[PDB]
Amino acid sequence: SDVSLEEDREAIRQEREQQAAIQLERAKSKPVAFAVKTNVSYCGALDEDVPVPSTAISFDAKDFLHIKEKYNNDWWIGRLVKEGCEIGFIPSPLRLENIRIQQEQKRHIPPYDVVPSMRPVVLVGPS
């Protein structure tokens, strides 16, 4: 039964992935929280730790991204602001810094310029 422990691990991974896919789909209706301009490129197809498989975005340096929310320390949710690009998982600045530390050894400017912004806020009831 050294492989029933691995089915337990898989079931845990699957539940986590299902919840991530829900939060991703539900982000589509949230407002844009803020924009960033990128100072680095990133290829989500080559990333392996993505909360949902095949949903990491890609972008070039000097692109603009729209961020809907932060998922965890390594991932945000949003989209490349270009026609046809859809919402997905976005590597956090920390993740990009750690990729850069690896790309460095084996083969300082922050990876995103965050654009702070005012937003129109309509007050609702205290619920």
What distances in angstroms separate CA 49 from CA 44, 52, 95, 108, 119, one per listed residue? 10, 8, 10, 25, 32
62 binds other proteins (CB under 8 A): yes
41 binds Ca ion (CB under 5 A): yes
- Cβ proximity to other proteins: between 46 and 121 the closer is 121
Six token digits for residue 102? 């690896």
C-alpha to C-alpha distance for 57 and 42, rounded to whole angstroms? 8
120 binds other proteins (CB under 8 A): yes
Which amino acid is located at 5 in the chain? L
- Cβ proximity to other proteins: between 81 and 99 the closer is 81
Contacts of 51 (CB under 8 A, 6+ apart): 16, 17, 20, 24, 71, 72, 75, 89
**Subset of residues 66 to 85 that bind Ca ion, contact rule: CB under 5 A:** 83-84
121 binds other proteins (CB under 8 A): yes
Q: Which does 41 bind (CB under 5 to 8 A by kind): other proteins, Ca ion, none?
A: Ca ion
Q: Would you tell me which residues interact with other proteins (CB under 8 A)?
A: 31-32, 34-35, 37, 62-64, 66, 81, 115-127
Site residues for Ca ion per CB under 5 A: 41, 83-84
